[PDB]
Design a protein around this nucleic acid. Sequence first.
DNA 1: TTTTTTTTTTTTTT
Lengths: 418, 147, 434, 431, 68
Amino acid sequence: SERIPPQSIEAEQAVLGAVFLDPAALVPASEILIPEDFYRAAHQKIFHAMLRVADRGEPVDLVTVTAELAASEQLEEIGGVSYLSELADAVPTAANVEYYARIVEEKSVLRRLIRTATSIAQDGYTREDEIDVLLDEADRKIMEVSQFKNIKDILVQTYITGIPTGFTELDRMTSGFQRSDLIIVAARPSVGKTAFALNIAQNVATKTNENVAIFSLEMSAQQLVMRMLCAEGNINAQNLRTGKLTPEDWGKLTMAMGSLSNAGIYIDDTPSIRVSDIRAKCRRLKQESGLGMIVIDYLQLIQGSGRSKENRQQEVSEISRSLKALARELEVPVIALSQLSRSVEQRQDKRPMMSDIRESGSIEQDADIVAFLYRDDYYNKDSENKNIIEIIIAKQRNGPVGTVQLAFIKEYNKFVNL
Amino acid sequence: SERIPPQSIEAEQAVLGAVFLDPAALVPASEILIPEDFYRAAHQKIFHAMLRVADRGEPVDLVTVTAELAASEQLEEIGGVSYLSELADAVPTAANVEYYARIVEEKSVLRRLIRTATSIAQDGYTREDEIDVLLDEADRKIMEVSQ
Amino acid sequence: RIPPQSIEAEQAVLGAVFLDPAALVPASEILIPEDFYRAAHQKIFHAMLRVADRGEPVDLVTVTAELAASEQLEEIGGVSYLSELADAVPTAANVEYYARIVEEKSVLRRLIRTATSIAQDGYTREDEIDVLLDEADRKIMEVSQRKHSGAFKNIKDILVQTYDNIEMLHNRDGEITGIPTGFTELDRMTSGFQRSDLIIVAARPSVGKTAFALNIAQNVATKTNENVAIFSLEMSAQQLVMRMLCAEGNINAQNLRTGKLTPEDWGKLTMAMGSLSNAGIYIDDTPSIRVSDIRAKCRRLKQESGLGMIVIDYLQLIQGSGRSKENRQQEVSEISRSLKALARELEVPVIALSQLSRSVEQRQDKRPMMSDIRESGSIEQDADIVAFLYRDDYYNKDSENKNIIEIIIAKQRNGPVGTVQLAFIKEYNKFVNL
Amino acid sequence: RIPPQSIEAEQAVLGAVFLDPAALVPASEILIPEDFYRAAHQKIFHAMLRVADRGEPVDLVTVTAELAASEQLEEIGGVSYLSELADAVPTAANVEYYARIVEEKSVLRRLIRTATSIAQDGYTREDEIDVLLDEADRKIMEVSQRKHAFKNIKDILVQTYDNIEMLHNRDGITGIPTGFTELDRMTSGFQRSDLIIVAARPSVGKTAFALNIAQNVATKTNENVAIFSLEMSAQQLVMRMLCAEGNINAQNLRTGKLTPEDWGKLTMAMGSLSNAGIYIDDTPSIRVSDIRAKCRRLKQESGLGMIVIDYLQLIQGSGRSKENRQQEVSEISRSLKALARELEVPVIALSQLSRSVEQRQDKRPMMSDIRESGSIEQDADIVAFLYRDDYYNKDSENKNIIEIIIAKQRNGPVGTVQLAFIKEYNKFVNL
Amino acid sequence: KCRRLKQESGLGMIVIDYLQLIQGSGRSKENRQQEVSEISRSLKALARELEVPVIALSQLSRRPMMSD
DNA sequence: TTTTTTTTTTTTTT
Ligand SMILES: Nc1nc2c(ncn2[C@@H]2O[C@H](COP(=O)(O)OP(=O)(O)O)[C@@H](O)[C@H]2O)c(=O)[nH]1
Ligand SMILES: Nc1nc2c(ncn2[C@@H]2O[C@H](COP(=O)(O)OP(=O)(O)O)[C@@H](O)[C@H]2O)c(=O)[nH]1
Ligand SMILES: Nc1nc2c(ncn2[C@@H]2O[C@H](COP(=O)(O)OP(=O)(O)O)[C@@H](O)[C@H]2O)c(=O)[nH]1
Ligand code: ALF
Ligand code: ALF
Ligand code: ALF
Ligand SMILES: [Ca+2]
Ligand SMILES: [Ca+2]
Ligand SMILES: [Ca+2]
Ligand SMILES: [Ca+2]
Ligand SMILES: [Ca+2]
Ligand SMILES: [Ca+2]
Ligand SMILES: [Ca+2]
């Protein structure tokens, strides 16, 4: 019934706030937004002023901005200096404006869509005159809700936002591991899925100060920790397995244990959980300690909410939705490991494409970002350049698509930079 | 705007009428239209029956059509034989069915457009979850409407 | 509830008899009086046959005379009911079909009636099981055992149609029986381009497929009086007409698309346009059609103007009927069938251009064989006639005797197989006799 | 309106089991629990079998133990009802008879039920008449252990001897004779119930050969032959036969450009072909069921001898959805053999061949080459390939010669036979 | 992308760095010959729709002839 | 909707 034009004027305030706090934060903000993207009339005017002052450039602080707003009839229209003062105290830091700007922008696009859709329907009843050209306008008007490098742009001239993974090249392409993202890491069996996830978890939990929850549905907590120890200290896994450790290995282990203690990584190895359970547990850990990342050791191993044992494709379709929504609710990146269907092993080229994600196509469709792992040496016994592993970033609606290379020293359960 | 979906019932009846009059006029008619293009539930069923009988082919006259409509539960649903009789008389001759068919068709497309645009707007307020795939659906749903 | 019946249809039959009345012959071949549901129609249709046995013959008078001759005229409604029957049948030339409805409904209730009496007997004769099951078996066949109607063409009847058809032929001047292409040597070998034939013209890319098809279309449309439909899925209508103009007037194609025309070229163009106007060639350049669409369009053009030929610019470009994106070989297998079936239904030659696989270029002898037809072998099979185009000069840059082009007639179930030779002056988009 | 049943006999069966209980063996060979009419007996006889599968075995104790093990002991009357069942029959010595009563009653109400549902469907599905009949036919046969007793060899040997006897008292081709001597020697007909596959590349001579056979059968013998042409019209077929019957050049015939002696030839070609009795159905799409129906009827009133089908892969499938096409034709293949078997008449199915063969050195076909499904090789009683050297060689020495390669037959001998195929006359001739 | 560039600036030519590098529409990674058979048609169709020459670069198997 | 195993017609893989 009551239809409220979509907006988040909390997030709006968070953007303007960050600018008064930083103000190098105006660069990302304006790359992402124009003044009109803001819903509240007042913010429109403020963010306009902010850019107006940057074009001088003054630069942009609480003073100069009010100076610019008074320079036009506008300072009284937007609330007082007292409103501009509130905007400042909105956020603790001008950390991650990029995040909130992208919310404001996404909402803007939504109502632009709604508006052009309603005006198409509107015109459906009126211009009953020229059917084929009405269909062209509809085509064209729906594309224009979306907003090719020129030769000149390409002449800038010859000759992390972001929870950081610790893999430079991936981080450059991605910049974290962003709050609220669903990150899918899929690859054939025994290729390196878990290894890669665990490596990321360590570098986050040890290098940063954030807590990470890992749900392992296949491996025990014990086996997980043993993988991390080997990777932290470069101890050969076979040796560690057996207890057959060299005198310096003991040193390496003593160390590895040290650093992993203050690491703060919470592991849940219950073999059958529903997403609701996962949510519950994380909600509580965030409550009392704060959460940074959630890792899930594997999406199709999670189990369904009651809908009866439904068309299994729908069952996972649903798990997929739930996870994204959990990532959204807790404002935290969620890395979900996925399997792939065997169809890749038919191809003469064994690099996965999005279609290959096992069991339900909705996973491609819910993910904020899809990463495949490919290893030449998985297939070739003799393969030249062994330890190399491609991290194919097949999808991301932050930005760039592409492949990144790392080394996967298997004896050490370890991924390394090159 | 109205809330009056685009249609042209002068024209639907004119098509069905021409078929009972000719009935070689069913050939142009069906090239141009499928039963669903008709707005009135009743005409849908009738034009379907007409094609159903042509596939035998009987062929298509006021008798065989009512025989086919009664063969399903439908003869009473579409008005009587008395409505089929009216359809016959809602026409001089069946020259240029192609013309009126293309009107019926064009109106069909209009409401199909209106219907998909409203459902896009509808979905705009609900599925605030995805943005990029919501824009994909809109892209894709509007192409599917040029057929 | 209500037993299956059609009075709309019963009346239509009786009506047609009072209208024709030669319509009583099909009617009675298909029906006996008992097949009618309404007690009254039973009696009327009986009277009709009763009067036919004299024979009177059957009209509104004699019938009422016969019905009054028994106690029956008042029982069936009045003369006023017989009068209504007259007025209540749309077109009397298809009594066959209304009769078949009345007949089909008759069979239905006969089935219902024997099925209910089986169930009936199930409770009663609980005595001898095996002979009860045999009777059920046997009683249900005796429904299927429906009399007259049952398509097997008796040979006595066909032979007559053949003699009479031969006869007709024998009084035509003669030579070509079909639609003449205007290429003498090909026409001698083929004699048209026969109604209902599927003609496949296949050859490697840029060899001359379309060129050859268009040339045939012109010579048919301008030399004869027949209409020809051309479906072009690759080229536009305007490119097609531009090819015909060049060929009709011997205007150099490069000159023509530049507008760089000599003073006599204009003359040639003025003529070309003149004759191509009264030509009557209907062009459909929609780049994706289903065969169903083609059928539909042709059916209508034949309706109001009459059709002679259908040309299709190429078969593997046509698109499938829904069966999902099936084993592609099957998809075209089906298109193939549909085309032959279309030529059959419209009683008109259908010339389908086809591509060839890379097979032939691998061979030493680059001349195509049937196997080479691209994408599905069913095309060789379905075709009435398969023509390949081979140009030596297509492969040899230097080739001795250039403009010559073989028309290899690799298949025909009319008659003779063989090769024919023509010249293909490419500068003029033109095929010529030798 | 009271369902056929025989409770007395039901009790007698259950009784005998509690009495014997080796009587359960015959009982279960004859009955399943559902055959019993009384809800209670159903459950009891189920329990009996359930306990036998352990096996306990089956007595008044173990049975009540099993019935109490489910919620059922109170539902079937008490232990007191099971006790009555024991006392109901004298001895166990003839469960077989009571079982057969229960069974016969079961069949009765199964019949009544399918009959009522046929009448039921009569008012509803007024849509398709011919496929509604077939279902009735088929639904009423399914009312038996109709798929089910062994045939003893002593008995077969006799009917075999007696057959050999009669064969001898003939008249030795066994056999509908094709009129091609060398083929007939190898084959002896064209036997009742055989499926004969004639396959060859396009425009090689498939139809021509089949038609020639049909004539010589229909005119030389007195038997009726049905031809289903799915590709050519009835007219085109008759025109081929006229040319072959009278040696009239086909080109002349289809122009009307006939010599004075040609009309003579035509006049008596027509003459002999009239009393020929060949029934032609040229409907371009039929299912095998349709073919079956039409033949069944023609045999009914005139008797049938041969069925010719202008061509197996052109036939269309029974509903199973547009299935793996190989299975679709796999099925048509089965149906055809089963039709030949049911009508006790040779069925000649023409077949196409895959392009496989065009790839070879030796262009003589092998069984594998049959187009679209390998089940055809397997189902066929006999597989005949046509090969023509002159089909591939433009210049070929000895033109009109054509091999009839008999690649398969489970009557007997395999081998090649030679004929001449005078194409100008649509005619195959002996050598 | 081209539809949009033509929309606001007008297009004249499209050049593509190479045809067999383009990737398939979902049909499962089909008989690869069909996959590019498809790309081929799509391209022609695109050239036709935008009324603009499309230059597609192509590789050759194994003076070339068309078969290659 | 998807994942699996089978048979059998096509094209194109240096
Ligand atoms: N050489 C060596 N390789 C190992 C050792 N331990 C594990 N690996 C390899 O490292 C990989 C880790 O398993 P993983 O890929 O995470 O399982 P996933 O979830 O299917 O991807 C496997 O491919 C193992 O073969 C070891 O002790 N020595
Ligand atoms: N000299 C000359 N030759 C041409 C001209 N236009 C076309 N041709 C040749 O004429 C033929 C016509 O195309 P076509 O063979 O019908 O295409 P197809 O459908 O693949 O058979 C081509 O093979 C051309 O290379 C022209 O303007 N001048
Ligand atoms: N010379 C000549 N050959 C003919 C004539 N009529 C038919 N043929 C040939 O006879 C053969 C008929 O083969 P057919 O059985 O219809 O092909 P199939 O059904 O696929 O085996 C073809 O090879 C034709 O070329 C004719 O009048 N003259
Ligand atoms: F081998 Al895994 F997930 F444990 F693919
Ligand atoms: F030009 Al083409 F087949 F090569 F039509
Ligand atoms: F071409 Al055919 F049977 F006449 F395959
Ligand atoms: Ca794992
Ligand atoms: Ca979803
Ligand atoms: Ca998939
Ligand atoms: Ca997002
Ligand atoms: Ca062409
Ligand atoms: Ca044939
Ligand atoms: Ca006779």
